[PDB]
Amino acid sequence: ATTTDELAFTRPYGEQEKQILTAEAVEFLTELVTHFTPQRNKLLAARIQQQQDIDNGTLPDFISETASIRDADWKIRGIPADLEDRRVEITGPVERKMVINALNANVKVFMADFEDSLAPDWNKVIDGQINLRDAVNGTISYTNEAGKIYQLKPNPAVLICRVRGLHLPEKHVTWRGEAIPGSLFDFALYFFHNYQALLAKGSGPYFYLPKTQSWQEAAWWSEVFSYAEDRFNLPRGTIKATLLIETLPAVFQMDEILHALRDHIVGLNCGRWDYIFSYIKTLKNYPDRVLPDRQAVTMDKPFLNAYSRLLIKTCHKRGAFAMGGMAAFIPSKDEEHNNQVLNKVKADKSLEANNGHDGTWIAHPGLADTAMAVFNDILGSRKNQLEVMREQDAPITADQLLAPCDGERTEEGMRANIRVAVQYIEAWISGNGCVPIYGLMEDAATAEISRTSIWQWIHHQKTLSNGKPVTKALFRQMLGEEMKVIASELGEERFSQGRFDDAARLMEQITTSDELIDFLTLPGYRLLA
Numbered sequence: 001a002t003t004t005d006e007l008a009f010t011r012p013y014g015e016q017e018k019q020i021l022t023a024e025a026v027e028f029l030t031e032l033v034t035h036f037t038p039q040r041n042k043l044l045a046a047r048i049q050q051q052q053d054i055d056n057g058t059l060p061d062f063i064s065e066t067a068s069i070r071d072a073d074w075k076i077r078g079i080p081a082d083l084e085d086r087r088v089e090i091t092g093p094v095e096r097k098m099v100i101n102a103l104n105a106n107v108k109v110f111m112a113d114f115e116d117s118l119a120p121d122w123n124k125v126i127d128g129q130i131n132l133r134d135a136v137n138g139t140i141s142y143t144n145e146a147g148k149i150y151q152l153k154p155n156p157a158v159l160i161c162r163v164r165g166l167h168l169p170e171k172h173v174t175w176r177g178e179a180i181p182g183s184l185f186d187f188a189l190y191f192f193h194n195y196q197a198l199l200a201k202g203s204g205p206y207f208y209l210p211k212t213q214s215w216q217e218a219a220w221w222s223e224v225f226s227y228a229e230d231r232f233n234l235p236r237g238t239i240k241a242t243l244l245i246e247t248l249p250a251v252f253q254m255d256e257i258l259h260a261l262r263d264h265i266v267g268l269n270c271g272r273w274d275y276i277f278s279y280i281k282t283l284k285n286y287p288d289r290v291l292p293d294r295q296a297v298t299m300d301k302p303f304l305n306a307y308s309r310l311l312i313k314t315c316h317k318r319g320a321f322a323m324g325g326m327a328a329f330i331p332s333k334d335e336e337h338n339n340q341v342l343n344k345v346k347a348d349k350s351l352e353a354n355n356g357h358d359g360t361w362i363a364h365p366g367l368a369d370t371a372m373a374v375f376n377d378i379l380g381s382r383k384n385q386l387e388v389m390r391e392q393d394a395p396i397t398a399d400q401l402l403a404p405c406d407g408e409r410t411e412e413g414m415r416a417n418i419r420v421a422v423q424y425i426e427a428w429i430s431g432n433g434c435v436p437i438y439g440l441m442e443d444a445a446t447a448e449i450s451r452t453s454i455w456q457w458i459h460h461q462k463t464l465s466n467g468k469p470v471t472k473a474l475f476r477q478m479l480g481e482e483m484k485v486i487a488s489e490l491g492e493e494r495f496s497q498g499r500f501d502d503a504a505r506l507m508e509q510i511t512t513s514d515e516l517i518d519f520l521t522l523p524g525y526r527l528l529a
């Protein structure tokens with residue numbers, strides 16, 4: 001085999017690729033890939049070894065050797081001015097119109113997403129980079145079929161780019177015959193095309209990093225960032241990252257993650273769906289760790305509240321932000337439904353603010369004013385809650401973080417999981433990873449917890465609360481039944497115009513396999529061009 005330090009490209013070099021994959025951009029991307037891919041692959045291999053040790057009966061806990069880091073005083077390098085107030089952030093797709101609408105929402109920050117809310121078609125990743133570049137440059141515009149123009153308002157929200165996670169390939173660009181890391185593709189191009197303009201306007205190249213499992217993974221990101229900074233003669237810490245704590249292994253390494261990424265990190269986030277998905281994957285072989293209906297596994301449950309409290313305390317100890325979770329409701333024409341939704345949003349955001357979270361997430365601009373009002377009210381004149389140390393809290397232990405919550409495993413819950421996951425998958429395979437389903441803007445994590453919970457119940461041969469043993473055969477029976485429900489809900493036209501048979505097949509494949517696959521996006525990505 002050759003010792004090449006060059007990349008190969010599988011798609012035609014058309015007008016879009018000519019904009020984004022310029023000679024200079026490709027040179028830089030090549031350098032990152034050859035310098036950092038081997039270590040990235042070693043990190044993926046380390047994941048396997050760590051998981052095996054957990055499977056083999058040793059539960060995760062804090063790291064003994066790094067005690068001196070945790071029990072020392074130190075803080076992150078710093079937070080730039082435009083990241084000191086992040087009380088509400090909106091998330092969404094890198095599609096052109098959606099970028100404009102999000103930047104125009106009444107929020108502090110827009111996280112443009114190449115990750116869970118994107119089905120990573122080549123055209124969509126390339127268009128996404130085009131869109132974000134136009135957004136940074138302030139020229140982004142869109143005119144719809146009806147002739148209505150969309151443009152940026154004055155003072156749009158601060159832009160942050162969420163990259164694909166460490167496990168994901170970008171199959172259309174290869175090094176030594178293997179797909180390069182999507183993480184490097186997404187990071188390299190957003191940074192390269194935008195760092196100059198961002199810095200010139202008083203902002204900076206900002207990233208969201210998903211699905212981290214270890215401090216060593218944080219260290220690798222720090223090296224990537226430092227490499228990028230050095231290459232363009234930027235001072236250390238110019239690139240700023242916010243890092244989701246949304247895997248079980250990561251909750252035991254928050255302080256080490258902050259330390260490893262100290263030059264660049266500005267905050268951590270709580271999640272729900274990815275976290276409990278990870279809980280099940282991590283504890284997959286443990287008969288005493290079966291979670292009930294994921295619908296009932298709410299953030300106020302003891303293990304999730306402990307997670308929340310530990311994350312806030314840890315972040316504030318180090319001067320980093322501690323971001324709360326997602327309210328993904330989509331307002332409807334039903335004002336009564338809307339009142340109930342807004343009451344729920346108010347209750348949930350108030351819980352987060354009262355706990356000390358510096359900010360929170362929404363998926364739809366229609367929730368901005370409500371979420372903002374909760375945080376405005378509780379913050380008073382403060383920009384954030386960095387001073388809230390939670391020093392009154394008792395220590396938080398591994399036992400507490402690992403304790404499965406009370407609840408029932410219900411047939412209604414199982415059926416709903418099937419309907420939501422199938423409809424999510426149908427859209428994803430059709431190129432849409434940000435999917436309105438039953439009044440919620442769903443991303444891949446929802447499909448993940450849905451399939452993973454069912455897998456868990458099958459694996460450990462658990463009964464539903466009505467006494468029915470959960471089996472592959474029961475699942476398959478229910479799948480067929482729920483497909484008919486979906487058909488009735490959507491109507492014959494939409495159902496026939498869709499990819500529901502292909503979606504049901506992928507669902508069955510990922511749910512009924514003996515081995516619990518890590519991510520549905522891996523087999524799913526095979527279905528994309």
Ligand SMILES: [Ca+2]
Pocket residue numbers: 049052053
């Ligand atoms: Ca081993």
Ligand SMILES: [Ca+2]
Pocket residue numbers: 116210244246271274445
């Ligand atoms: Ca997530």
